[PDB]
Nucleic acid binder design. Structure first.
Lengths: 224, 159, 211, 156
RNA sequence: GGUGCAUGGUUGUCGUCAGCUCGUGUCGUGAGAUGUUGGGUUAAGUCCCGCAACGAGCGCAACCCCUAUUGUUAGUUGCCA
RNA sequence: GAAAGCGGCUCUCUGGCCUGUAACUGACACUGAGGCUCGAAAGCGUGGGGAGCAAACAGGAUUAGAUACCCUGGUAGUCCACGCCGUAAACGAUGAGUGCUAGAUGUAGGGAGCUAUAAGUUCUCUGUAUCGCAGCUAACGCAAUAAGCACUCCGCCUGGG
């Protein structure tokens, strides 16, 4: 149950950030520095990622909602495709504060995302003159801005995966509100002792989010 | 000065403490230049002085400022409110006198972390440039992938 | 200052309570019929006033009436507004006309809700839970924008207290106000109580255009 | 739903531009007399609105003290600013010996007796926090048998 | 008549302001922050970008008349091309 | 440099650290009431030196008024040897000693490597910042030169006038 650092080399997973503002707790993983980025060897991060290879299966097989967040720049379409194969929805948008504990925010996000969108999909769009087009700026713009995708989901997920909690301080506190566990790809720029997993990965290379997010939601497939 | 309008508007008028009004506005005529118009407008009521309203308005030749203020005693309202007119002119010193109060951007690569030269195929696809501004992680230094016009993976490379 | 919604509707933006025309004695029959409407609202003293529109006609009068319910107001079986209607015939001396029509669901009427809860203010109800109670009844029964208003005057008090649960989208500045609104003074030894009920079930109200 | 106690309606204000907005606040404590105590706060305009907010905040931060038979584990302390509440187990079942804002606490936690004055201040919004802390300092005998590493026969 | 810092209701004003608010929520011992901070634009808290936020109002703005372009009516006592 | 403070230049005799070092004493340690010394800033004593500056005061605006800010000046005084006061926001309104420890960080001058065909890096010590782990307080904030966790010498403090 391993797709290891023997193939995680060039796609850009096991690398740090620009070698500044790193964190002193996380030094037994990230060692070297040259040409702008830290480079991570195969010593601990292989079985460290194999831990997630065990537990994403274990959380997946009990039949609960999963959640991925790919807000970061080269990481939206991975959470798209692995939300498709995972089955539960994607978060690919800049993160909105106040998500979980406020009901009618995401509930009205459901009702205007799809239910007032039924007015678009039925005989209300073609019966109103040009003043409905700005109503479709609220619809045709504020639906995919305030997208969510949460209308499939009737109850809080099992896992809150995230490309970067250091860029995503917000839902990390929302997930540690009522007790939902998290998964992330946490690099040198964060101290992941609150995070359940240590995945030393960055975004803007070619296939880091593709590999790690791929076999994570594959573990969700065999969990489902 | 020029003109008054003395007005006791609930009780009759008595020119001892009204003369005391006339003398503290005599000290307005120590702080005058043209005492253009004033007006006393006072009000005292029943129930053993649960108020003491007084007023004098101040249309001077440039500024206007009234005073409908209170104390328990009407004598104390003449006292503290005309002393309030003194301290108002003390506020009106500087408010009166002191009309003077006295191409390509010359910059480095905007990205932070280094990306290898194979990632430049994705880094050109990252932000939407035909080149890929990325400090090379695989190659020692800087590398970038262009777009050759034939349609293959180009390389803007000193190499 | 506050604009009266019905004060800018019921004249011409909503059609008239004196919904009839004349040639010369328009304000004569209009004003004296308004005195007759006062006689209706004061001689329903063992009944419930809802709405009345007394009319002058081609037969020189057709009295339009309304009730809050027919089963109790109009009589033992319908002879209080009929015997009192002939009493209006011996008031003003004319052909005199009954119109037994319940104003439907008077828990959505500003008259019976606010005036009824003001009669219960005469019965000394806790007025805050009266506000939440009554506006929760009608907001429960629709009322897209609904609020009310109560004045103060408790045994030598100030002008007016606050007004809890005075809510509801009532865009009174805008020109879409379809509001059953009322107001009331309760005269007591302890003082008077103003009760002003905005009820907004319908959305639109110009009643002024016709081909 | 919990067993209810109401501490006090507070007195706070909002100072608007052209006057003085009447702000309203409250603080309750809840729980089901077993060791579980919560507390709520009403930042509103009226009393049942502060009951609404009082259960909005009373529904959370409601945890369990390891109640060793209607008693305390041992003598603890609570410090949060001027809330300085030292709680003492003593002879139990013979008189609920507590301050006013903490007699409700061992009511809603179910301690038989305590011996709890306070120092610092009698400010209730620090009394409740020092009370949470006074429950928080407690290790228990199953941990001194367990977390200490040896099943010590002071409790066994 | 007296008693409008005792009365209700009406009532003039700031201000025809563009600001005022509130609910959910989070954060802060607490009042307090959230909307309201935001990028220009407007007359607009206009929308809009980041945003602990989201929504709801109260809104100038939106709906009402009057005049400012043309058809359906055409002689009444008014129009005669 | 304990601070007070110390900056044209050159000599005179002059402390005090740190880096290394066990060569050596073998606990000689830390303090510190008392007592003693030093010590801002003025001023005071005697005697000089007297550019420029400036208390005191004068003249001119200033306004109701100007004994003030501005200007014109201008005495004491500022400087030099030579004695004194012992009081300064003395401050960082943060006693002295030593121990502990996330890091991002300044800069000195050593010790060591260091990078070699000249380059330029890493550790170590006392320094002095800035952010911030923990801890932390009423909050503000402090945080390796702790407002964190300990102990020894002292000192203060008891509601306001």
């Amino acid at each position: 149950s391993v797709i290891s650092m023997k193939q995680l080399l060039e796609a850009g997973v096991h690398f740090g950030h620009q070698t500044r503002r790193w964190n002193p707790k996380m030094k037994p993983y990230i060692f070297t520095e040259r040409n702008g980025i830290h480079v991570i060897d195969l010593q601990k991060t292989v079985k460290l990622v194999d831990d997630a290879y065990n537990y994403v299966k274990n959380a997946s097989q009990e039949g609960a909602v999963v959640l991925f967040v790919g807000t970061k720049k080269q990481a939206a379409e991975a959470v798209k495709e692995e939300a498709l194969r995972a089955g539960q929805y994607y978060v690919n948008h800049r993160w909105l504060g106040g998500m979980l504990t406020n009901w009618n925010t995401i509930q009205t996000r459901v009702t205007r995302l799809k239910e007032i969108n039924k007015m678009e999909e039925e005989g209300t769009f073609e019966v109103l003159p040009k003043k409905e087009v700005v109503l479709l700026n609220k619809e045709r713009e504020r639906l995919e801005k305030f997208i969510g995708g949460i209308a499939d989901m009737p109850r809080i997920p099992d896992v809150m995966y995230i490309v970067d909690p250091h860029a995503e301080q917000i839902a990390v506190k929302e997930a540690k509100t009522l007790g939902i566990p998290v998964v992330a790809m946490v690099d040198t720029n964060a101290d992941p002792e609150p995070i359940d997993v240590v995945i030393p990965a960055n975004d803007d290379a070619i296939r880091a989010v593709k590999l790690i997010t791929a076999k994570m939601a594959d573990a969700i497939i065999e969990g489902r | 000065m020029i003109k008054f309008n003395i007005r006791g508007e609930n009780v009759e008028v008595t020119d001892a403490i009204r003369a005391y009004v006339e003398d503290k506005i005599g000290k307005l005529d120590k702080y005058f230049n043209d005492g253009h118009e004033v007006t006393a407008y006072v009000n005292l009521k029943v129930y053993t002085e649960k108020r003491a309203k007084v007023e004098v308005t101040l249309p001077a030749k440039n500024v206007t400022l009234r005073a409908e203020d209170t104390s328990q005693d009407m004598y104390s309202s003449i006292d503290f409110v005309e002393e309030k007119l003194e301290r108002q002119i003390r506020k009106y010193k500087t408010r009166m006198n002191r009309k003077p109060r006295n191409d390509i951007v010359r910059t480095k690569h905007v990205a932070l972390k280094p990306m290898d030269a194979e990632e430049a195929v994705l880094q050109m696809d990252m932000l939407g440039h035909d080149f890929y501004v990325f400090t090379d992680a695989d190659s020692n230094g800087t590398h970038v992938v262009y777009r050759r016009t034939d349609g293959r993976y180009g390389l803007i490379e000193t190499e | 200052q506050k604009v009266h919604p019905i004060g800018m509707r019921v004249g011409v933006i909503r059609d008239w309570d004196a919904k009839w025309y004349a040639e010369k004695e328009y304000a004569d029959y209009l004003h004296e019929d308004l005195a007759i409407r006062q006689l209706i609202q004061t001689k329903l003293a063992d009944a419930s006033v809802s709405l009345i529109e007394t009319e002058r006609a081609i037969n020189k009068v057709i009295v339009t009436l309304h009730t809050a319910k027919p089963g109790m107001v109009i009589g033992k079986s319908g002879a209080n507004v009929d015997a009192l209607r002939a009493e209006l015939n011996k008031l003003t001396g004319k052909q005199v006309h009954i119109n037994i029509v319940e104003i439907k669901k008077p828990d959505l009427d500003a008259h019976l809700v606010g005036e009824g809860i003001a009669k219960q203010l005469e019965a000394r109800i806790a007025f805050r839970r009266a506000q939440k109670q009554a506006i929760q009844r009608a907001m429960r029964a629709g009322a897209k924008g609904i609020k009310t208003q109560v004045s103060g005057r408790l045994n030598g008090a100030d002008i007016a207290r606050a007004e809890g649960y005075s809510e509801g989208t009532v865009p009174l500045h805008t020109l879409r106000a379809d509001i059953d609104y009322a107001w009331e003074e309760a005269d007591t030894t302890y003082g008077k109580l103003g009760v002003k009920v905005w009820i907004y079930r319908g959305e639109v109200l110009p009643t002024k255009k016709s081909v | 739903e919990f067993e209810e106690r109401v501490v006090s309606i507070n007195r706070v204000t909002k100072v608007v531009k052209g006057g003085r907005r009447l702000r309203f606040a409250a603080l309750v404590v809840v729980g089901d007399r077993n060791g579980r105590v919560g507390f709520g706060t009403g930042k509103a305009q009226e009393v049942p609105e502060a009951i609404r907010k009082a259960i909005e905040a009373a529904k959370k931060n409601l945890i369990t003290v390891p109640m060793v038979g209607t008693t305390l584990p041992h003598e603890a302390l609570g410090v949060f600013g001027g809330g300085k509440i030292l709680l003492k187990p003593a002879v139990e079942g013979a008189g609920v010996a507590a301050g006013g804002a903490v007699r409700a606490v061992l009511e809603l936690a179910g301690v038989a007796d305590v011996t709890s004055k306070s120092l610092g201040s009698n400010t209730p919004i620090n009394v409740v926090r020092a009370t949470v802390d006074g429950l928080t300092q407690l290790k228990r005998a199953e941990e001194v048998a367990a977390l200490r590493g040896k099943s010590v026969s002071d409790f066994a």
